[PDB]
Design an enzyme around this catalytic site. Structure first.
Site, PDB file in Angstrom:
ATOM      1  CG  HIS A  66      -2.139 -15.264  -6.971  1.00 54.04           C
ATOM      2  ND1 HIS A  66      -3.036 -15.340  -8.017  1.00 54.04           N
ATOM      3  CD2 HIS A  66      -1.942 -16.534  -6.546  1.00 54.04           C
ATOM      4  CE1 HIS A  66      -3.396 -16.601  -8.186  1.00 54.04           C
ATOM      5  NE2 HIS A  66      -2.743 -17.344  -7.309  1.00 54.04           N
ATOM      6  CG  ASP A 130     -13.867 -11.857  -6.933  1.00 57.60           C
ATOM      7  OD1 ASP A 130     -14.696 -11.528  -6.056  1.00 57.60           O
ATOM      8  OD2 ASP A 130     -13.702 -11.123  -7.926  1.00 57.60           O
ATOM      9  CD  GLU A 243     -17.318  -9.841  -7.383  1.00 56.43           C
ATOM     10  OE1 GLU A 243     -16.583 -10.039  -6.398  1.00 56.43           O
ATOM     11  OE2 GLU A 243     -17.075 -10.297  -8.526  1.00 56.43           O
TER      12      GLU A 243
HETATM   13  C1  LIG Z   1      -3.641 -14.446  -8.724  1.00 53.68           C
HETATM   14  C2  LIG Z   1      -4.939 -13.697  -8.532  1.00 53.68           C
HETATM   15  C3  LIG Z   1      -4.946 -12.566  -7.715  1.00 53.68           C
HETATM   16  C4  LIG Z   1      -6.141 -12.033  -7.245  1.00 53.68           C
HETATM   17  C5  LIG Z   1      -7.350 -12.633  -7.581  1.00 53.68           C
HETATM   18  C6  LIG Z   1      -7.350 -13.762  -8.391  1.00 53.68           C
HETATM   19  C7  LIG Z   1      -6.153 -14.297  -8.866  1.00 53.68           C
HETATM   20  C8  LIG Z   1      -6.172 -15.677  -9.459  1.00 53.68           C
HETATM   21  N1  LIG Z   1      -8.541 -12.111  -7.116  1.00 53.68           N
HETATM   22  C9  LIG Z   1      -8.526 -10.997  -6.304  1.00 53.68           C
HETATM   23  C10 LIG Z   1      -9.711 -10.461  -5.817  1.00 53.68           C
HETATM   24  O1  LIG Z   1     -10.786 -10.996  -6.075  1.00 53.68           O
HETATM   25  N2  LIG Z   1      -9.681  -9.345  -5.009  1.00 53.68           N
HETATM   26  C11 LIG Z   1      -8.478  -8.762  -4.677  1.00 53.68           C
HETATM   27  O2  LIG Z   1      -8.449  -7.767  -3.956  1.00 53.68           O
HETATM   28  N3  LIG Z   1      -7.298  -9.290  -5.159  1.00 53.68           N
HETATM   29  C12 LIG Z   1      -7.316 -10.402  -5.970  1.00 53.68           C
HETATM   30  N4  LIG Z   1      -6.127 -10.911  -6.445  1.00 53.68           N
HETATM   31  C13 LIG Z   1      -4.894 -10.049  -6.380  1.00 53.68           C
HETATM   32  C14 LIG Z   1      -4.137 -10.295  -5.071  1.00 53.68           C
HETATM   33  O3  LIG Z   1      -4.764  -9.618  -4.008  1.00 53.68           O
HETATM   34  C15 LIG Z   1      -2.687  -9.840  -5.208  1.00 53.68           C
HETATM   35  O4  LIG Z   1      -2.030 -10.736  -6.079  1.00 53.68           O
HETATM   36  C16 LIG Z   1      -1.955  -9.744  -3.868  1.00 53.68           C
HETATM   37  O5  LIG Z   1      -0.576  -9.582  -4.109  1.00 53.68           O
HETATM   38  C17 LIG Z   1      -2.141 -10.983  -3.001  1.00 53.68           C
HETATM   39  O6  LIG Z   1      -1.351 -12.006  -3.564  1.00 53.68           O
HETATM   40  P1  LIG Z   1      -0.224 -12.758  -2.705  1.00 53.68           P
HETATM   41  O7  LIG Z   1      -0.792 -13.102  -1.375  1.00 53.68           O
HETATM   42  O8  LIG Z   1       0.279 -13.991  -3.466  1.00 53.68           O
HETATM   43  O9  LIG Z   1       0.909 -11.651  -2.468  1.00 53.68           O
HETATM   44  P2  LIG Z   1       2.196 -11.468  -3.409  1.00 53.68           P
HETATM   45  O10 LIG Z   1       1.772 -11.256  -4.805  1.00 53.68           O
HETATM   46  O11 LIG Z   1       3.194 -12.617  -3.220  1.00 53.68           O
HETATM   47  O12 LIG Z   1       2.802 -10.092  -2.850  1.00 53.68           O
HETATM   48  C18 LIG Z   1       2.134  -8.885  -3.143  1.00 53.68           C
HETATM   49  C19 LIG Z   1       2.874  -7.731  -2.491  1.00 53.68           C
HETATM   50  O13 LIG Z   1       2.617  -7.717  -1.097  1.00 53.68           O
HETATM   51  C20 LIG Z   1       3.814  -7.927  -0.368  1.00 53.68           C
HETATM   52  N5  LIG Z   1       3.525  -8.869   0.725  1.00 53.68           N
HETATM   53  C21 LIG Z   1       3.165 -10.189   0.628  1.00 53.68           C
HETATM   54  N6  LIG Z   1       2.976 -10.660   1.879  1.00 53.68           N
HETATM   55  C22 LIG Z   1       3.205  -9.665   2.766  1.00 53.68           C
HETATM   56  C23 LIG Z   1       3.154  -9.599   4.154  1.00 53.68           C
HETATM   57  N7  LIG Z   1       2.984 -10.707   4.878  1.00 53.68           N
HETATM   58  N8  LIG Z   1       3.451  -8.407   4.782  1.00 53.68           N
HETATM   59  C24 LIG Z   1       3.793  -7.292   4.047  1.00 53.68           C
HETATM   60  N9  LIG Z   1       3.832  -7.366   2.673  1.00 53.68           N
HETATM   61  C25 LIG Z   1       3.546  -8.531   2.049  1.00 53.68           C
HETATM   62  C26 LIG Z   1       4.861  -8.430  -1.356  1.00 53.68           C
HETATM   63  O14 LIG Z   1       6.151  -7.949  -1.025  1.00 53.68           O
HETATM   64  C27 LIG Z   1       4.377  -7.856  -2.672  1.00 53.68           C
HETATM   65  O15 LIG Z   1       4.871  -6.548  -2.832  1.00 53.68           O
HETATM   66  C1  LIG Z   2     -10.342  -7.261  -8.498  1.00 55.67           C
HETATM   67  C2  LIG Z   2     -11.404  -8.138  -8.675  1.00 55.67           C
HETATM   68  C3  LIG Z   2     -11.160  -9.479  -8.939  1.00 55.67           C
HETATM   69  C4  LIG Z   2      -9.857  -9.947  -9.029  1.00 55.67           C
HETATM   70  C5  LIG Z   2      -9.605 -11.400  -9.315  1.00 55.67           C
HETATM   71  N1  LIG Z   2     -10.862 -12.156  -9.000  1.00 55.67           N
HETATM   72  C6  LIG Z   2     -11.064 -13.272  -9.980  1.00 55.67           C
HETATM   73  N2  LIG Z   2     -10.017 -13.900 -10.569  1.00 55.67           N
HETATM   74  C7  LIG Z   2     -10.199 -14.906 -11.447  1.00 55.67           C
HETATM   75  N3  LIG Z   2     -11.413 -15.361 -11.805  1.00 55.67           N
HETATM   76  C8  LIG Z   2     -12.513 -14.800 -11.271  1.00 55.67           C
HETATM   77  N4  LIG Z   2     -13.831 -15.135 -11.513  1.00 55.67           N
HETATM   78  C9  LIG Z   2     -14.510 -14.241 -10.700  1.00 55.67           C
HETATM   79  N5  LIG Z   2     -13.713 -13.372  -9.966  1.00 55.67           N
HETATM   80  C10 LIG Z   2     -12.426 -13.727 -10.329  1.00 55.67           C
HETATM   81  C11 LIG Z   2      -8.791  -9.072  -8.856  1.00 55.67           C
HETATM   82  C12 LIG Z   2      -9.036  -7.727  -8.591  1.00 55.67           C
END
Ligand SMILES: *Cc1cc2c(cc1C)nc1c(=O)[nH]c(=O)nc-1n2C[C@H](O)[C@H](O)[C@H](O)COP(=O)(O)OP(=O)(O)OC[C@H]1O[C@@H](n2cnc3c(N)ncnc32)[C@H](O)[C@@H]1O
Ligand SMILES: c1ccc(CNc2ncnc3[nH]cnc23)cc1
Ligand SMILES: *[C@@H]1O[C@H](CO)[C@@H](O[C@@H]2O[C@H](CO)[C@@H](O)[C@H](O)[C@H]2NC(C)=O)[C@H](O)[C@H]1NC(C)=O
Ligand SMILES: *[C@@H]1O[C@H](CO)[C@@H](O)[C@H](O)[C@H]1NC(C)=O
Ligand SMILES: *[C@@H]1O[C@H](CO)[C@@H](O)[C@H](O)[C@H]1NC(C)=O
Ligand SMILES: *[C@@H]1O[C@H](CO)[C@@H](O)[C@H](O)[C@H]1NC(C)=O
Length: 479
Positions: A66, A130, A243
């Site tokens: 993500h 979220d 929020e």
């Molecule tokens: C896609 C998106 C992201 C998102 C969101 C809504 C959408 C549709 N809403 C969020 C929200 O409301 N609040 C928030 O704090 N974050 C929100 N996100 C962003 C999301 O947190 C980030 O995309 C985050 O990376 C989590 O995504 P994901 O789980 O898919 O992790 P990744 O992108 O593949 O990797 C991110 C980095 O972290 C490292 N990683 C991943 N897993 C681990 C573990 N197990 N241990 C150590 N490091 C880890 C990866 O290497 C990468 O650098």
């Molecule tokens: C900080 C805050 C939120 C997010 C991503 N949440 C989010 N993503 C997509 N659509 C939404 N509708 C309401 N909340 C969200 C990433 C970083």
């Protein structure tokens, strides 16, 4: 070995799938993709990396990819397909504790699954994102923020302990009581120090339902003041979640309808309100109260606020339904081919003292006269609920705002320039923001991100836990 066991894949489909992310803006082919069936395979990989001179490969841990800007890529390296850890039917990757006070979850597990498992035991994590299809390890590597963070801290403030395999290939259990340096580093640590294979997540007795309200303003001062009111320490007020969103005039109706909260009639009402006031921007607080008693409690809280009378909108839903609200949006948008598009999202933490300036320059300024698709989310957070000893960086003020401009994209170039412009505005205005979910590309920007003291600690932990600088190179901090 791993490969022969078919765990280490180099075929085109594997590397291709691990070469893009949700941002859909940058891409980077890895040399290989590990599909580990157990943490033992991760230990084997990292132990090999640790003990092999001339070890060639950086290593990223893809949760669900993500990431917005290649943070989960390992260009010419090894991407770990963490999801593989959760393939086996047994043993379970999510264990609610015997006493229901916490839930152990594999780092690869998505929060939606953590929720479902917890609810089966009558409990639930207290701090969310979220959007629930993110991994435990992934959000914990960043911070994990949603409307509960003001009173419970981000998700990194709600972790009892973790199992981490470091860059040394050593499996370490860490917490405030044991290997606290690793514990602190990994939380908000951007995948730099080790892979989280297990996180112990605090839970609370699960509420059954949420009274879910949206409050409308045309006055940013009133909007922000009310948000700060609702999230102010008393211990905190009654609201379980706070929020807010911003709607620029040009796409007012569209964006209002896009919330999925307002009926077409609600939207018409709000557009009319904005019209009667010649408002260039409309604001909405989004709040819930988890639980006739609710009625009076809600009335009492709402009575302290200054939203436009007649403009409190109310839903009442099952708690799980509220938590997973965004999934429905994804399913819907995807059917219109509007989910899998470039996401030039701008996310930052803006100090309270400058949020009105930000509003003036960005919401009333830069963003005006454009067709916005994607929520513009704004809400205050309490620094007190963040642990500054952890890697996550936040503004210095007691209160700062999460500002999340979730732009969906010839639009891409325009949007990217727009973001540069927003950042330029903030820099010129001397707004001491911190980015969230963003990767910087040079040392000075990263050092500024963390600040001198935290940066120095960050480096100390890197030397200790990932001296070869293999881990999560896509963050572009040490790579
Ligand atoms: C896609 C998106 C992201 C998102 C969101 C809504 C959408 C549709 N809403 C969020 C929200 O409301 N609040 C928030 O704090 N974050 C929100 N996100 C962003 C999301 O947190 C980030 O995309 C985050 O990376 C989590 O995504 P994901 O789980 O898919 O992790 P990744 O992108 O593949 O990797 C991110 C980095 O972290 C490292 N990683 C991943 N897993 C681990 C573990 N197990 N241990 C150590 N490091 C880890 C990866 O290497 C990468 O650098
Ligand atoms: C900080 C805050 C939120 C997010 C991503 N949440 C989010 N993503 C997509 N659509 C939404 N509708 C309401 N909340 C969200 C990433 C970083
Ligand atoms: C959930 O709890 C179970 C214990 O019942 C764990 O399952 C064990 O996991 C270890 C190491 O991963 C294995 O060596 C054992 O064979 C498993 N035992 C059983 C009963 O199958 C599981 O690891 C836990 N999950 C998490 C994420 O902590
Ligand atoms: C973005 O997604 C499209 C599919 O719509 C894909 O063809 C393209 O390669 C992706 N670009 C990046 C950088 O991920
Ligand atoms: C890491 O490598 C060092 C030598 O470079 C070795 O002594 C140590 O045992 C290794 N640890 C693991 C788990 O491979
Ligand atoms: C809002 O935008 C519409 C076009 O979308 C425009 O007609 C109207 O003048 C704008 N309102 C204000 C207050 O500028």
């Amino acid at each position: 070995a791993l490969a022969l066991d078919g765990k280490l894949r180099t075929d085109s489909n594997a590397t291709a799938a691990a070469s893009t992310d949700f941002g859909n803006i940058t891409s980077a082919l890895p040399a290989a993709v590990l599909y580990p069936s157990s943490t033992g395979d991760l230990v084997a990989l990292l132990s090999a990396a640790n003990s092999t001179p001339g070890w060639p490969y950086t290593i990223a841990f893809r949760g669900r990819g993500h990431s917005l800007m290649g943070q989960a890529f390992a260009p010419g390296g090894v991407v770990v397909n963490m999801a593989s850890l959760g393939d086996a039917a047994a043993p379970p990757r999510i264990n609610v504790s015997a006493d229901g006070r916490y839930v152990d979850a594999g780092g690869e597990q998505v929060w939606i699954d953590v929720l479902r498992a917890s609810l089966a035991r009558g409990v639930a994590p207290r701090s969310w994102t979220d959007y629930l299809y993110l991994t435990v390890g992934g959000t914990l590597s960043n911070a994990g923020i949603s409307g509960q963070a003001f009173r419970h801290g981000p998700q990194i403030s709600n972790v009892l302990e973790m199992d981490v395999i470091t860059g040394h290939g050593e499996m370490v259990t860490c917490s405030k009581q044991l290997n606290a340096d690793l514990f602190d580093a990994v939380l908000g640590g951007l995948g730099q120090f080790g892979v989280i294979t297990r996180a112990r997540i605090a839970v609370e007795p699960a509420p059954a339902r949420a009274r879910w309200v949206r409050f409308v303003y045309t006055d940013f001062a009133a909007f922000s003041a009310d948000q700060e009111r609702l999230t102010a320490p008393r211990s905190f007020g009654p609201m379980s979640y706070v929020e807010g969103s911003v709607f620029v005039n040009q796409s007012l109706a569209t964006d209002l309808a896009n919330t999925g909260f307002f009926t077409d009639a609600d939207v018409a009402r709000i557009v009319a309100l904005a019209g009667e006031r010649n408002a260039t921007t409309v604001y909405s607080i989004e709040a819930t109260l988890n639980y006739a008693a609710v009625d009076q409690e809600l009335a009492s809280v709402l009575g302290t606020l200054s939203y436009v009378e007649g403009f409190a909108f109310q839903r009442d839903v099952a708690y799980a339904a509220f938590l997973d609200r965004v999934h429905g949006e994804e399913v819907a948008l995807n059917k219109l081919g509007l989910w899998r598009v470039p996401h030039p999202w701008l996310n930052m933490f803006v100090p309270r003292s400058r949020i009105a300036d930000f509003d003036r320059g960005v919401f009333k300024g830069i963003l005006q006269g454009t067709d916005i698709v994607g929520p513009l989310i704004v809400y205050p957070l309490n620094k007190s609920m963040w642990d500054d000893g952890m890697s996550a960086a936040t503004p210095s003020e007691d209160v700062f705002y999460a500002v999340s401009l979730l732009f969906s994209s010839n639009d891409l170039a325009r949007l990217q320039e727009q973001n540069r412009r927003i950042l330029r505005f903030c820099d010129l205005a001397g707004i001491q923001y911190k980015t969230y979910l963003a990767r910087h590309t040079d040392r000075s920007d990263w050092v500024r991100h963390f600040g001198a003291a935290k940066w120095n600690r960050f480096v100390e932990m890197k030397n200790k836990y990932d001296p070869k600088r293999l881990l999560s190179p896509g963050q572009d901090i040490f790579n």
